[PDB]
Design a protein around this ligand. Structure first.
Ligand SMILES: O=C(O)c1cccc(-c2cccnc2)c1
Ligand SMILES: O=C(O)c1cccc(-c2cccnc2)c1
Ligand SMILES: [Cl-]
Lengths: 241, 241
């Protein structure tokens, strides 16, 4: 590991504070602006939709990425949630209610065994089965996010290869002639400190860089900074043009 | 099918000639600027790397999307061909020599066998086993490209689901918050008429539009028009912003 305190400027300039963690797969070397915060554990919030998808697919709770989960007819504050969804759109729009039903069908016992099986975070599902990743006892750090994402990339998680391919398809966020990003955002508000996540990796012709960032998020006005700050660290380190 | 000659303006502006074919999956309706050229069968050229990849993967010639295929040391006119590749990069750069090695190991019989199962074009592989899609007898029209792609999208081709998922990953071309494009380019130069291809689909939240276009290509200077003209039609039809 190598600490690069010059990156703190990227958070300072937007009157913010947070951590970005990078991992060079080819060289097996990591980088962060803050070794301390890189190992501090936060609620995963909607970043939990990755393992939640893996478990639901492997158990048959979700048949495939085409299965439609109909809106329950309850009007919610986020308009894009008030409609039918499949796996791709449910993760694109971070549709909490869809994944809360997943959790209720997966059940306490199978969820716990799988998270220990994944070595995910502190592997503690204490709380309510349908919201513990939002206000329960589960916690995970940025460096731990990267360890989990690296296994997903290599199809090393203890679920089928098919489940890992579908979830990685669902994680597709951005793609052009220069790079491919697969990631998931997160926004934790029910427990202090309020933070936003962005975890995933960038695929190049001859390498993959894994990343995991979290930052203070006192208001929803700053959510766009999750991607904005991350990409700047990538540009600075010459990972993306 | 419905003919929309107003699209011809997009070809005329760039002193070009060609066809674009679109298919609305939800509504099971097709649209094109030239019904006749839409059903005209040409050499597939590098669009053939879709079926070829499916065959190589299903037969074990290709293990997975990470397997490395060494450069043979022959300096060729296209710089990106003079290096090592995997399935992802081999298609991104239309690396002919990599896929000719696939064909040689697939063999004449198994290739003919598979294309019949795919109902691909005229199913005629006459010529060299490793160049028939470049200067052999195989022929396929734009409408037939879409019919074949529709089976791939729905995992209905007679190869494993795994093979079809991998090829759909390797077809990834562009992705943003508004759409995803999985497609493949083509460039037929060895036999007249010289044309360029672009075939695939654009994934939206609530629908999928399949597309297949070809145009006259007397010189390599106009290759970039394949994507440009297609997108102008997509913008006009309000499919992409
Ligand atoms: O960005 C996210 O991951 C996410 C997930 C759930 C809810 C929200 C959210 C909640 C309230 C306002 N704006 C966004 C964001
Ligand atoms: O764009 C293509 O699909 C493609 C495929 C194979 C070869 C070529 C090509 C051929 C000659 C010069 N420049 C590019 C283009
Ligand atoms: Cl993909």
């Amino acid at each position: 590991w190598q600490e690069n305190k010059s990156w703190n400027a990227h958070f300072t300039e937007h009157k913010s504070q947070g951590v970005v963690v990078l991992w060079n797969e080819n060289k097996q070397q990591g980088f962060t602006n803050n070794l301390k915060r890189a190992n501090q554990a936060f609620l995963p919030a909607s970043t939990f939709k990755i393992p939640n998808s893996l478990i639901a697919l492997d158990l048959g709770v979700v048949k495939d990425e085409h299965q439609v989960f109909k809106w329950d007819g309850q009007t919610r504050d986020i308009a894009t949630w008030n409609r039918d969804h499949n796996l791709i759109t449910a993760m694109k729009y971070s549709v909490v209610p869809v994944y809360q039903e997943f959790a209720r069908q997966i059940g306490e016992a199978r969820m716990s065994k799988m998270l220990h099986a994944f070595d995910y975070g502190n592997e503690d599902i204490s709380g309510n089965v349908d919201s513990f990743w939002l206000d329960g006892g589960i916690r995970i750090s940025a460096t731990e996010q990267i360890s989990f994402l690296r296994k997903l990339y290599h199809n090393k998680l203890h679920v089928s290869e098919r489940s890992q391919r579908i979830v990685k398809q669902a994680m597709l966020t951005e793609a052009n002639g220069d790079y491919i990003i697969r990631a998931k955002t997160g926004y934790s508000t029910r427990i202090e400190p309020k933070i936003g996540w962005w975890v995933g990796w960038v695929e190049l012709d001859d390498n993959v860089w894994f990343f995991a960032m979290n930052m203070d998020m006192p208001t929803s006005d700053g959510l766009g900074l999750r991607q904005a700050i991350t990409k700047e660290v990538l540009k600075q380190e010459k990972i993306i043009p």
